[PDB]
Amino acid sequence: GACKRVGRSDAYATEFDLEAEEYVPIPKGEVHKKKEIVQDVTLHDLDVANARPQGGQDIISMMGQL
Amino acid sequence: RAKAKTRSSRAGLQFPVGRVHRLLRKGNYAERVGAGAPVYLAAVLEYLTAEILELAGNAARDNKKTRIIPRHLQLAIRNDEELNKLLGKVTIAQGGVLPNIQAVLLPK
Amino acid sequence: IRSLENDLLRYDKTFSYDMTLDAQRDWSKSLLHAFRYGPRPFDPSSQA
Amino acid sequence: TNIESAPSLAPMKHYCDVTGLPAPYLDPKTRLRYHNKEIFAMIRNLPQGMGEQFLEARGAHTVLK
Amino acid sequence: DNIQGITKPAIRRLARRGGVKRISGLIYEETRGVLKVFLENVIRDAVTYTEHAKRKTVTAMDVVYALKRQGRTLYGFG
Amino acid sequence: KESYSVYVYKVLKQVHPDTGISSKAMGIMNSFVNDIFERIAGEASRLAHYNKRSTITSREIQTAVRLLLPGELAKHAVSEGTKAVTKYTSS
């Protein structure tokens, strides 16, 4: 359930003339790519991810001091 | 009746398309006058007015004055090749001449 | 400019003919000759 | 009958109308799509009576009446 | 070129008709320049009338109107 | 007693907003307007009578402007006039 906006498609590129987006072409492959990945996790990463909230929703960490 | 939209505006003009039309029609230039004709003539009259007045204000600023007068109009109409060709046989009251002294007459 | 460019062409290896004023002013540069006429040189007003 | 022709509503990719190359920007004086500065030079010194024929070839000339 | 078809002899004759006794060699090219400017002015107006009339042929009347426009009224045509 | 004063004033306060113009200068400018009007209208009438037309269309006014005004002046005038007539037609 992870989502990223890559850009605005180049068919709707010249709708206006000085919009500010990243105009990328439509991907010339499948729409449903199915691939499998073997991937490792160390138990210390489990320890850290269960102790403190990490990375994703930890927005108060931009202060820095305490 | 629907609200009266002045033709000058319908046109995006300051000049009176209405009066121009009267003058063309009542002025015997021909039996029939189109709407297009008034519009175009009014536009051309505005353009030349603009050019002259612009050059004149430029001259007035050059002489540190706030008010366009005849001498200013004259110096404007004479420093442009095109306006001076359009008005080459016209005299402007209180306009004066452009400063000019021949070389052979200058001190040697 | 031509005198300086001639000197740079003879002694400077990093200076190519493309960087000369004459090169920046020649048919081979403009696209309109390639659009109307092609990569061959201009028409000398011949018959065919 | 004969009213089955349908228009469109979609972003159009505007190309040049002097040449055929893709052109990204137009002009205020003559309203011509143009590719680069050579075509801009040939647009701003073309003889009169042709700057309207390019819009005639593209359409929406709007000649006077 | 074609302007050099207005030959040195032709210009001489025109100067003679005007009462000119002696002609500097520089007159010939000046005369050609002056003539070309005059013809350009008349032809510009003649073509303008021709275009207005939706014609492709320049007529005698277009030239006569162009000349009258410029204060050089020509009798004998039209 | 009608004069193109009003309009000369509106154009002035559009092109040099804080500058005025004198009464004498207004007179001269109004005379300018009348003169150009007359010349263009008259050339247009002549063109009409010469082409056996009885109407002074936009196209007569255009050709009058091209005969009367020199070079760049003529070109810019044609441009402005065409723009104006186009806007009028659109409205």
The gist of it:
This is part of a larger assembly, with chains A (66 residues), B (108 residues), C (48 residues), D (65 residues), E (78 residues) and F (91 residues). Chain D is mainly α and 65 residues long. Chain D contains two helices and no strands.
Offer a few descriptive terms.
part of a larger assembly, 6 chains, C: 48 residues, mainly alpha, 2 helices, 33% helix, elongated, F: 91 residues, Histone, subunit A, 4 helices, phosphoprotein (chain B)
Describe this structure in words.
- This is part of a larger assembly, with chains A (66 residues), B (108 residues), C (48 residues), D (65 residues), E (78 residues) and F (91 residues).
- Chain C has 48 residues and is mainly alpha-helical.
- Helix content of chain C is 33%, strand content 0%.
- Chain C contains two helices and no strands.
- The relative contact order of chain C is 0.13.
- Chain D is mainly α and 65 residues long.
- Chain D has two helices and no strands.
- Chain D starts with 36 loop residues before the first helix and ends in a 7-residue tail after the last helix.
- Chain E has 78 residues and is mostly helical.
- Chain E has one domain: Histone, subunit A.
- In chain E, helix 2 packs across helix 3.
- Chain E is elongated and about 45 Å long.
- The longest helix of chain F has 28 residues.
- Chain F has a single domain, classed as Histone, subunit A (Orthogonal Bundle).
- Chain F is globular, with a radius of gyration of 15 Å.
- Chain F is built from four helices and two strands; from the N terminus they run H-E-H-E-H-H.
- Chains in contact: A-D, B-F, C-D, D-F, E-F.
- Chains B and F meet through helix 2, strand 1, helix 3, strand 2 and helix 4 of B and helix 1, strand 1, helix 2, strand 2 and helix 3 of F.
- Strand 2 of chain B pairs parallel with strand 1 of chain F.
- The PDB classes it as dna binding protein.
Range of helix content of chain D: 10-25%
Number of strands of chain D: 0
Quickly count the helices of chain E.
3
SS-derived structural category of chain E: mainly alpha
The CATH superfamily of chain E turns out to be: Histone, subunit A
By helix and strand content of chain D, what is the structural category? mainly alpha
Over the alpha carbons, how many angstroms does the gyration radius of chain E reach?
Answer: 15 Å
**Main sheet of chain D, how many strands, which sense, barrel?**
none
**CATH architecture level-2 label of chain E:** Orthogonal Bundle
* Head-to-tail CA distance between termini of chain D: 31 Å
Rg of chain D computed from alpha carbons, rounded to a whole number of angstroms: 15 Å
Biggest chain contact: B-F, 61 and 60 residues
Give, in order, the helices and strands of chain D. HH
- Assembly category: part of a larger assembly
Order of helices and strands of chain E: HHH
